[PDB]
């Protein structure tokens, strides 16, 4: 209240705003510099649009999750800062120099098979951790995967993440960006789990060679169609019990499509193991889709050339 003691909440003024780095799909993210040490950080402002119920419950959730998740492959919340009418709140994270979407959209950037192996390894290890801690990321995409100047991958943007549990769960279906959204969600599933993040891992893995999102739908129907043109068609034979809320109840799906995952990517990938793992990630039935644990065990991470450190690039 203008002149109130606040030992554990520092004013954001301690950091110097250098550049906006979130204008596309997200709210207010800034690259900033600690005014005394020079430490680079990222400042995410907590948005107060239609916040009629005080401090956003959504932000309380994200903060709770960020405080819980402490791992080499998960972004690190340093602290929460205030700003001394009305006054804002910022989430302060250690800055990461690159993002997978950026490196992939850069023709000059080039990955060896060894480094692609490493990227996937860190990503899947991050996912294993978060899931082990009963958290679903729910927003898997190249742009949400960051890489430090030292080649350490971090899962970022937990704003849509949520805790999950073990009669049925009614989690939100308004989850995951369309291109990365798994079949389950597109078919209206609300009792989903960690396999949603793995489908997203699959899309990203394939993107490491194609350099472009493999399935770029415009609507849920277009997305479902695109998925069918790649993974074969949604069949109770392929996906036991798929025939339950749609499949026939409108959502006009294909019927003749046959799996072309390995054929369509055969060009770009070439490595047998990489193609096999992608095939096991982009599985229709969430229950038959490989988990992070088994994916990490896959021969792709345990055959030559073995995973190597990131120097490509710089």
């Amino acid at each position: 209240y203008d002149d109130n003691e606040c030992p554990f909440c520092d004013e954001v003024s301690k950091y110097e705003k250098l550049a906006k780095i979130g204008q596309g799909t997200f709210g207010e993210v800034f690259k900033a510099r600690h005014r005394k040490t020079g430490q680079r950080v990222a400042l995410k402002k907590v948005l107060m649009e239609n916040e009629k119920e005080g401090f956003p419950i959504t932000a309380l959730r994200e903060i709770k999750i960020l405080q819980l998740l402490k791992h080499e492959n998960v972004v690190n919340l340093i602290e929460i800062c205030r700003t001394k009418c009305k006054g804002s709140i910022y989430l302060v994270f250690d800055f990461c120099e690159h993002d997978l979407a950026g490196l992939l959209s850069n023709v000059l950037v080039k990955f060896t098979l060894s480094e692609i192996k490493r990227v996937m390894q860190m990503l899947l290890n991050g996912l294993f951790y978060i899931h082990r801690n009963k958290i679903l990321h729910r927003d898997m995409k190249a742009a949400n995967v960051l890489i430090t100047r030292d080649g350490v991958l971090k899962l970022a943007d937990f704003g849509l993440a949520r805790a999950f549990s073990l009669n049925p769960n009614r989690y939100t279906n308004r989850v995951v960006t369309l291109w990365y959204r798994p079949p389950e969600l597109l078919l209206g599933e609300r009792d989903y789990g960690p396999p949603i993040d793995l489908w997203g891992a699959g899309c990203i893995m394939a993107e490491m060679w194609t350099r472009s999102p493999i399935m770029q739908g415009n609507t849920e129907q277009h997305q479902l169609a695109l998925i069918s043109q790649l993974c074969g068609s949604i069949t109770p034979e392929v996906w036991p019990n798929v025939d339950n809320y749609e499949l026939y109840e409108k959502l006009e799906l294909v019927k003749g499509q046959k799996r072309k995952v390995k054929d369509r990517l055969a060009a770009y990938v070439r490595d047998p193991y990489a193609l096999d793992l992608i095939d096991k990630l982009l599985v229709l039935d969430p229950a038959q889709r490989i988990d992070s644990e088994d994916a990490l065990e896959h021969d792709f991470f345990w055959s030559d050339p073995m995973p190597s450190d990131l120097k490509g690039m710089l």
Binding site: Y1, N4, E5, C6, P7, F8, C9, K52, E53, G54, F55, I57, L60, I63, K64, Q67, L68, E79, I80, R82
Partner: protein, 252 residues
């Protein structure tokens, strides 16, 4: 930090409120009144005891930083509970919390018109105060209660429903009546509660085959000397609390 919200008795003596001339015993009463208001409102709002307990820890911690002279309990309690209900996933609407806080504090008064400037202001006062709480606590809102550890222990001791239920009662009342939450870790406070419940019920937990006392399996730091010191403190405040001990009194 690990010791951020744990204080020595000297640190508890030199509190923010003490700096503005509030006697130690007066400050303890201000804390007990706030915990009672939180319990009263919480019951009416139909939130869990867990939510109420979380709001009580917020209050306790809040007043290790702020003074009762600047922030009255009757203003902080509704904001603390509004926050705790959101944190603990039982969100209650702002208008709702305001209506309940008002009836608890002014039974004979009538809630202002939800269109009045006086009502619009008290809505804003809550929001402002929730924000001051978040910042005082430095956004560390995840609370470990000792009830978690009591359940663990009362099973790993094979206690009657009765013994376990008496222990939970001790745990809840230790939040209302003491500052143990600002001094001892929840596993330690849990040991204090189980110990007192046993003394009250004339229950004796037998020594393990190894020669280890039950509490050694709960917290390595814990000593019988401390347990007896703390159970005595808790029992004395409980004897001072009318009708509280009646709740656990075996009349047979």
């Amino acid at each position: 930090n690990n010791k951020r919200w744990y204080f020595t008795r000297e640190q508890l003596e030199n509190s923010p409120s003490r700096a503005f001339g509030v006697d130690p015993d007066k400050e303890l009463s201000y804390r007990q009144q706030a915990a009672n208001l939180l319990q009263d409102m919480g019951q009416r709002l139909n939130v869990s005891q867990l939510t109420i307990n979380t709001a009580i820890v917020y209050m306790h911690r809040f007043y290790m930083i702020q003074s009762f002279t600047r922030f009255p309990g009757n203003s902080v309690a509704p904001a603390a509970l509004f926050l705790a209900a959101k944190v603990e996933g039982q969100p209650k609407k702002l208008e709702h919390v305001i209506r309940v806080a008002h009836t608890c504090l002014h039974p004979q008064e009538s809630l202002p018109d939800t269109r009045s400037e006086a009502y619009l202001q008290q809505v804003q006062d809550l929001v402002i105060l929730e924000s001051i709480i978040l910042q005082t606590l430095g956004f560390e809102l995840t609370i470990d209660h000792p009830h978690t550890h009591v359940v663990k222990c009362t099973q790993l001791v094979r206690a009657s429903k009765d013994l376990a239920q008496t222990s939970y009662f001790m745990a809840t009342n230790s939040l209302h009546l003491t500052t143990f939450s600002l001094q001892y870790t929840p596993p330690v406070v849990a040991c204090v509660c189980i110990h007192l419940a046993c003394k009250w019920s004339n229950w004796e937990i037998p020594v393990s085959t190894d020669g280890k006392h039950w509490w050694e399996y709960v917290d390595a730091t814990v000593t019988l000397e401390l347990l007896d010191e703390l159970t005595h403190e808790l029992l004395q405040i409980l004897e001072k609390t009318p009708n509280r001990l009646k709740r656990i009194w075996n009349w047979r």
